[PDB]
């Protein structure tokens, strides 16, 4: 599966740089944006790797030196952890789960300080890990503005229109260390995932594997994230994780992965691959269709389950009473 790079420069990566997991996978298609099969996959909301969009062509020259000189003097959210797992957590929800202690911490920081922290860790051989995750804004320097304007807006705007998506909400800049991992989760927006530097292994699971991936409660800070530790699955708590099957690919500079809304994805920076750089494109999903057709799709049932949990958390006046009432509803009645 590793592609040979032009100029006889050899394989870009090697299977030894991939972490080992308990489940099988099959590859995501790698297609040209002009291939009608690629158009068919996006329309049916299925993942595809597009190899020739030129979506972030001007950003392919980006490295830490260029960015530090040009990305401005704004604050950048930088996560710090002692584990390779950078589990996302919503800070606004930690009040209702005050016995949850995240294993990664967020630190606001200037870009040059992030490069310095990176360098100091590299020097002292430390094992602290950093993952910069910052939405692009108007604090960026002029050259970054020019690069941003140089993205292939013609292509992605036509995608937005053809799929009826809502607004572009964010462009998340992602700069991670080799071996970094974002555990499995699904997002409530459409995503074009544009790789810039380094290589990222992406493992996706369709929405109909909800039963196998056990998301946290909606009111938990790790809402939308899987409870399963992919490194040591607890099959007694999560028995159906023994049935997961992933869609896998390794994206490199110039590749764009369509991560459809509600699709779970596990993403890791290749071992011994250096730093990785990515910019995503998050779009609001199309509205609920005019006429509902039955039976519902998996992602529609996910939307329903989320709304049930939201309603009960509100009606009961306390999110931690959601579980007890749900169990009362079902024990000896629906199970």
């Amino acid at each position: 599966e590793p592609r040979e790079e032009a100029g006889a420069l050899g394989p870009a990566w090697d299977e030894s740089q991939l972490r080992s997991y308990s489940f099988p996978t099959r590859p995501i298609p790698r297609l040209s944006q002009s291939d009608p099969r690629a158009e068919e996959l996006i329309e049916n909301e299925e993942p595809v790797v597009l190899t020739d969009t030129n979506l972030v062509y001007p950003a392919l020259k980006w490295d830490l030196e260029y960015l530090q000189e040009n990305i401005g003097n704004g604050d950048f959210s930088v996560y710090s952890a002692s584990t390779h797992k950078f589990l996302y957590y919503d800070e606004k929800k930690m009040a209702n789960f005050q016995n949850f202690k995240p294993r990664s911490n967020r630190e606001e920081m200037k870009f040059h300080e992030f490069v310095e922290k990176l360098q100091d860790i590299q020097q002292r051989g430390g094992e602290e890990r950093l993952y910069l995750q910052q939405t692009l804004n108007d604090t960026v320097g002029r050259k970054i503005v020019m690069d941003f304007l140089g993205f292939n807006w013609n292509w992605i705007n036509k995608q937005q229109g053809k799929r009826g998506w809502g607004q572009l909400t964010s462009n998340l800049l992602l700069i991670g260390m080799e071996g970094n991992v974002t555990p499995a989760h699904y997002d409530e927006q459409q995503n074009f995932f544009a790789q810039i530097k380094g290589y990222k292994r992406c493992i996706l699971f369709p929405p109909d594997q909800f039963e196998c991936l056990y998301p946290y409660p909606v009111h938990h800070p790790c809402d939308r994230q899987s409870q399963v530790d992919f490194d040591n699955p607890d099959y007694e708590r999560f028995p159906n994780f023994q049935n997961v099957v992933g869609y896998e690919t390794v994206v490199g500079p110039g590749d764009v992965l369509y991560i459809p809304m509600y699709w779970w994805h596990h993403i890791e920076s290749l071992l011994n691959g250096g730093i990785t750089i990515t910019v995503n494109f998050w779009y609001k999903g199309a509205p609920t269709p005019k006429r509902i057709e039955y039976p519902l799709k998996a992602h529609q049932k996910v939307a329903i389950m989320r709304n049930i949990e939201k309603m009960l958390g509100e009606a009961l006046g306390n999110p931690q009473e959601v579980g007890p009432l749900l169990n009362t509803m079902i024990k000896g009645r629906y199970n």
């Binding site: 959210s77 996302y88 919503d90 800070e91 606004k92 967020r106 995750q133 939405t135 809502g166 909400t169 964010s170 998340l172 974002t182 989760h185 997002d187 409530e188 927006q189 809402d223 939308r224 998050w282 609001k284 999903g285 609920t288 509902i292 529609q300 939307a303 329903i304 989320r306 709304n307 049930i308």
Partner: peptide, 17 residues
């Protein structure tokens, strides 16, 4: 058909504070 439309509504939450 409104109960269905109500429960089918989605947010826009992503892994970004």
């Amino acid at each position: 058909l409104e109960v269905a439309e109500y429960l089918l509504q989605h947010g826009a939450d992503v892994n970004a504070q």
